[PDB]
């Protein structure tokens, strides 16, 4: 019912589609820092096999749900498949979370969540929450989009980041505008999150569980 806009994004074998598209946005970068560094002394390889989508749940955007609820989700994070085993068999590596965020209600509600993908951190000041508009981020509103999407690069502090004890990437969605069921609108919107780790290479290796 418009200028018309659709889109499917393939990562390995996994492919998220959508219709309330709106587009996307890459921030900070669009590339990747020469991952043929000195510290990895040629001892690094491409494993674009675990490069794809996995599901994890954000909060539940509810009418009450105040002007701040911004369910965080660190990236990296628990992986019951590939990328996870990789982090358990490896010390040094680096990637780039794709991230294609959905939040289903319908084209009748009010309010907006604020999607953003920010690096190194610890915790944020509420007074600062008024500037996610500074790091890779999207804006959701059921009257145009149902999907978000924003594809993040690699920042790390180093070329080949270690994750056993460090997580450079964090994902927040503060409720910028509270939700309104309304007359005929939907009842509730569970914000679902679809992620994927891209252009990633490893270096390093430990013994085994034995």
């Amino acid at each position: 019912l418009l200028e018309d806009r659709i889109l499917t994004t393939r990562n390995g074998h996994t492919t998220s589609t959508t219709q309330s598209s709106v587009g996307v946005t890459y921030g900070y970068a669009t590339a990747e820092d020469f991952v043929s560094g000195p510290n990895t002394s040629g001892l690094e390889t491409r494993v674009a096999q675990a490069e794809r989508f996995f599901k994890t749940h954000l909060f539940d955007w509810v009418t009450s749900d105040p002007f701040g609820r911004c369910h965080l989700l660190e990236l990296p994070t628990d992986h019951k498949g590939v990328y996870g085993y990789l982090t358990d068999s490896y010390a040094y590596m680096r990637n780039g979370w794709d991230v294609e965020v959905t939040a289903v209600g319908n084209q009748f509600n009010g309010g907006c969540l604020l999607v953003a993908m920010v690096p190194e951190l610890c915790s944020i000041q509420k007074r600062e929450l008024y500037q996610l508009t500074l790091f890779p981020h999207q804006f959701i509103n059921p009257r145009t989009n149902m999907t978000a999407h924003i594809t993040v690069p690699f920042v790390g502090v180093n070329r080949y980041d270690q994750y056993k004890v460090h997580k450079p990437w964090t994902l927040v969605v503060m409720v910028v505008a509270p939700l309104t069921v309304n007359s005929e609108g939907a009842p509730q919107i569970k914000v679902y999150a679809n992620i994927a780790p891209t252009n990633v290479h490893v270096a390093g290796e430990f013994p085994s569980k034995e």
């Binding site: 001892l43 040094y92 390093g204 290796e205 430990f206 013994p207 034995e210």
Partner: peptide, 21 residues
Amino acid sequence: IAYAPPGMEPPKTPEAAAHCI
């Protein structure tokens, strides 16, 4: 000659070790 990295403690069985470089 095994060579493991930071994140785990070194082996004691070339068997477990044959998994490093």
